[PDB]
Amino acid sequence: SQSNRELVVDFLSYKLSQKGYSWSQFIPMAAVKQALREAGDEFELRYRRAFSDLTSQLHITPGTAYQSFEQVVNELFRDGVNWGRIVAFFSFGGALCVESVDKEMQVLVSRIASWMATYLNDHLEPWIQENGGWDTFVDLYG
């Protein structure tokens, strides 16, 4: 929803801050948000490769359209949706942001944000809602 757009902005801001970039280019939600930040960190610790293959497959330019992104993120979900995969979906957005800023393409950041939120609303929310909503996400990772 607007709520999902806000989860995504939070997470990406959190990740940009953490890694010493700027974030200026942009039941409770707060509990969801803290759960997600922590989820991200935890997951990035276990796999430090930063989806280099996936970022390579995308290789985002300002001419890159949503449909290309969607195809790449789909790769994450070959075997269906997961709590863990959603988290990877979030990290992936973060890496892509970082990678954008590194390439003096900080304009892509809020676009990636919109794409992520479209993707989540369209492809991810349905499974979320079906498996207990973000409450359950909280129970799990909180």
Describe the protein in words:
The protein is an all-alpha fold. The chain has one domain: Blc2-like (Apoptosis Regulator Bcl-x). 73% of the residues lie in helices and 0% in strands. Helix 1 packs across helix 2, helix 2 crosses helix 5 and helix 5 packs antiparallel against helix 6. The radius of gyration is 14 Å and the shape is globular. 27% of the residues are buried. It is classed as apoptosis.
Structural class: mainly alpha
**CATH H-level name... which superfamily?**
Blc2-like
Distance between the termini: 21 Å
Q: Quickly count the domains.
A: 1
State the CATH architecture: Orthogonal Bundle
Shape: globular
Secondary-structure element pattern, one letter each:
HHHHHHH
Please identify the top-level CATH class.
Mainly Alpha
Strand content: under 5%
Question: What name is given to the CATH topology?
Answer: Apoptosis Regulator Bcl-x
- Could you describe the largest sheet, including whether it forms a barrel? none
PDB class: apoptosis
Keywords: Membrane, Mitochondrion
Assembly: monomeric
Entry title: Crystal structure of mouse Bcl-xl (wt) at pH 6.0
